[PDB]
Nucleic acid binder design. Structure first.
Length: 56
RNA sequence: CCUUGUUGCUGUGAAGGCUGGCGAAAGCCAGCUGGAGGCGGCAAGCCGUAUUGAUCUGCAAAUCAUUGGCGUAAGCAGGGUA
RNA sequence: UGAACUCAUUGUGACAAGGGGAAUCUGACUGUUUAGUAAAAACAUAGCUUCAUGAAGAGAGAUGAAGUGAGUUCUGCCCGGU
RNA sequence: CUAUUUAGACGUAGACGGGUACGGGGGAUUAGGGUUUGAUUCCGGAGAGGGAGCCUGAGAGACGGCUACCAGGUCCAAGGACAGCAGCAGGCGCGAAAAUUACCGAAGCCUCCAAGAGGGCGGUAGUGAAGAGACGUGAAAACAAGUGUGUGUAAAAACCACAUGAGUAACUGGAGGUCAAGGCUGGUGCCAGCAUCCGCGGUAAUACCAGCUCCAGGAGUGUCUAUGAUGAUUGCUGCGAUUAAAAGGUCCGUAGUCGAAGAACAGUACUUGUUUGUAAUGUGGCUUAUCGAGAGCCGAAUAGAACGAGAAGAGUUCAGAGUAAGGAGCGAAGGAGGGCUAGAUUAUUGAGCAGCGAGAGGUGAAAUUUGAUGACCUGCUUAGGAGUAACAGAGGCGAAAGCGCUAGUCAAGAACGAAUCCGAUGAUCAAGGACGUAGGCUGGAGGAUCGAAGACGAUUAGAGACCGUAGUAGUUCCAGCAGUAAACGAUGCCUACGCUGUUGUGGUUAUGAGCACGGCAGAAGAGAAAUCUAGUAGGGCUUUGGGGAGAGUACGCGCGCAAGCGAUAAAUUUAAAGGAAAUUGACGGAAGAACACCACAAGGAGUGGAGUGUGCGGCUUAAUUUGACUCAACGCGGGACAGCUUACCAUACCCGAUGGCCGUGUGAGCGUAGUACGCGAUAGGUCAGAGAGUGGUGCAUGGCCGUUAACGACGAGUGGGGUGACCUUUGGGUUAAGUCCGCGAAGUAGUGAGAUCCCUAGGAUACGAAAGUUAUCGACAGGUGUUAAAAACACAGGAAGGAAGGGGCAAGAACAGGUCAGUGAUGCCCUUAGAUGGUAUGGGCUGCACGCGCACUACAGUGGUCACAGCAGAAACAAAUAGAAGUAAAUGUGAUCGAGAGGGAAUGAGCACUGUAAUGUGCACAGGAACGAGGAAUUGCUAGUAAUCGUUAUCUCAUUAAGAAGCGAUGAAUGUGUCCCUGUUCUUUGUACACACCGCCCGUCGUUAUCGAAGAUGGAACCAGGUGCGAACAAGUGAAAGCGAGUGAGUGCAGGGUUCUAGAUCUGAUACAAGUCGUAACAAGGCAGCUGUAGGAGAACCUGUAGCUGGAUCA
């Protein structure tokens, strides 16, 4: 029974190209760690609930 | 059908037997002894495959040479008888 | 059965004396046949199967008639015609 | 190595052959016990393209020495010459795979005749994210990498010191679960892709493709491939074998592994001391480079060996010792244990003869078939070959397979009783040996019954099968071969420790009990449960399993006359497996209780047959619009259609939210006796996008209905049992109803029923003066009779008597039940000015060869006709001279008619009514069809019921009832039961179904792919041997010429041993979305299934014979 290869690549053609927006140089090493440690202060409490990423 | 004549040399090695080993048994393995067979190679013989040889006014109204098949046997043969 | 020495082509010295292997068709084997153009795959053979008979100087492990062809393995279906 | 003598040497504790390998010190992982690796700094071995010979030397069978062959090369003037990077750089190939044709009088060492010469050995840098350390990528005031001097070195660079500039510096994999972190926004619509595994995507994708935010590790992070761990899935420590994979059919037996008490003895294992035995690595430490890997120094150490010591266990010996260890023997007794000899009561067939005179046989029902040549049945005679009924059992015997009549005879064994004898003789078992139901095979004997194969008769779409008739090999015996079973208690053999009650068999007994071999019922433990040959446990020895498939198959080998059997692989494929047991449903062609005139039995009236009225299918037509199909479609869709209804056909006529773009008072359109007159923007073409439809899909839905069912079921706490899915427990009586009464590891409250309305029947003491109306009352099985309780009848009184009668309301769960043509209830698809939207005039829905469902008049006399009366539920009625809607009718009295004067179908010329229109209805006169009580079947109904008779101021309705829904008149007949039919509920029952029987599933045939066997004829390579021939070198002998043992490379010719590969054709397996033919298995799966063996067959499979329950029976 018939088979064909006519459709290879389709979705990569049809998805509209969007440009990457600019951003700062991010931290690295201990610098990144001081930044994370201040954000997560709630979580280091044994009560209440932190949430890393929410879209509401 | 009755009465007779005619088996020399060699190979292979069945049945039966004796020793030695192995095995709990049954019975297995060696070496020797024995000498069966419409069994092998030949002789005397009996036959007739090839050369499509010789001969074809023949040696001969069926022979000759070399080459072949069987040869311890449903083998070959004289006389008497049907 | 060994060993040594010896020879100018080497030694079953003349005579006598197997060529061998791989496959296929066919008949089991030894045996027989067209005297005088055919020796064969043809005939025979052991074994297998069928048939008829209580008659005998013979008495069913008998006496005659046919077909197939040792051994192994198989031998299906049809009694309308003759 | 050679001469003569002796036959040895080595093997199941694995010889010999083949395959594979540099060996250790050490490395990786690791709680422990282990599993894997070692070309690779140290030690020892071998080699220098492949083989072989050799001179020199203290030392080489040397290759940066020589000589010859074989395979390859280089230069030439063609005559000859040279050469070997598994040294250091470097090049080409091969591969998925690995650096500079660099500097060196310095460090560590080696070489010479040396106050010096040589060394790619060694050192120094360059190159590369194989590995391992320490740190940058900012701080809150103030941060690498640069540069210059000095150092450093053999010379350098880097490193470090001081001094100058300054302000540079993160990516890889992810975000549904395992597994840390987004239902974010846009594309795509089972596509494209993602995903180790599970799984995502069919237009609402937290999983694809991207954007944006988060997470993890970080100068690093992902992937592929080997291995160690995960893993008690290789089990010494430490798994399993009743049913999941797994105990050999039973014995004997060698090698092997394992083996009393008592008294003594000896030191080789065993354990331990002292001394040896380890550079690096590793282990326990300390000291110096800024720190940390690194470097330097210290201490102890494995296996292996030398010499002493201790004697528990192991070992050796002894007999004034004699196992709930074995063998020999004695006494009395028991048993379908085995071989042989001689007898037996019946039965089934066959023949003979006699009696009798028509059928016998076989089945669910029948046909083949046999009988007047006398069957069948009943007598008497006989001839054979099998078998041992009932007694006969959770009884006995045997190693298992197996063994059942009675006597006699011949060997051996088990158990029991007891002061017999010998003394370790024993347990288990590769190899080897003996037995083994049935079916089968080789030869003989025989042949009653039964019966594979083969042949018929039936049944079926087809039966080749199941059933019946018949019939052969076999089924029996003797002498052998064979070697398998669901050969199963699916539970190896010895030996232990272990609770109670009961019942057997054989001996013995202080009569209390024991010993051997059993059955049964609990308990406690155990186990995933079911259950227990399964409890406790490092006792000994053998067999044996490691996810499904392919496969107990291929090749080789051993046995067999054959049939075959024993033993046993790879390639390939796949996420689970009809894997195990237990829980809830659905299903069955099961079993057991119940119940009911919408079930039946015993009783009433009909339907099915005629004509007509009406609905359904079929056909016709321009159109005859359409839903619904077992109960639970068919006078049903409130479906009595002239128009309307109306969805269909013919002709004709009529009709548009908004927004953008394009035009307009010089007129964008409209009215008309329509073209010249009247009115004017209002309402104008095209793209988007809205808002009709009796158009489609009820398998996209809501609501409402119908049906299960008008049935007894049905949720909550707390409590008991089970690991849990789950059950609340023994099913005995009653009602319409788990409605109730008993009893319980259960007990307490609720829904449903019931109770709770409304109508109909009786009732003033209330109200009225009109004469009726309404009523909180009245009935409870209360009374009597029936001797547990719960109910019950039968009487009696009573207006009403066992749910007073009749309605009405009415659990949970269900169904792919009906309706989109009821709905401004509704998703999605379709049409939409030449409409699938409205309207009008007509035509159809009403056509007519024909099959069906439900009604109406009938078939007369228990009638027809004439007159006259007279009565309902209650109360409604211009007039009418033949006649043209209305206040009962059956019925009561008198006449009449007399067995087609019953009956009114098709049809004629008329006379009126309703209506917009007759085609519809009424009236008068004719006319006068079938039908003379209905085949197979089939439907309700228990009392003011059924049937009869009219009537509707009820519904449809201008006019049309032969339809429903009421209402009254006249008024019966039969049981008082049952589970047989027909159904419906509950409890036990089986399962490979859960998507739930419309389920699931087997095998041929045909088409594709992929991997493997065989096969006439064949190819490589690569090893060792056997024969030829023989280059180089050569001891010896010779003045010399020569001659030449021996060591041998290469190469002839035959063979073998290994590994690959070709091959016409045949034959397996696996995957085939769904192709063709059947339906073999799973329910009693429609003939219960399965194992062995033998025939047969399109194919699953079918048939004989023995076996098993994993069966549909613990009886």
């Amino acid at each position: 029974k018939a088979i064909s290869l006519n459709k290879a690549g389709k979705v990569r053609g049809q998805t509209p190209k969007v440009e990457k927006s600019e951003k700062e140089k991010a931290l690295t090493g201990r610098a990144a760690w001081r930044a994370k440690f201040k954000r997560r202060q709630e979580l280091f409490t044994g009560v209440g609930k932190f949430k890393f990423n929410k879209q509401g």
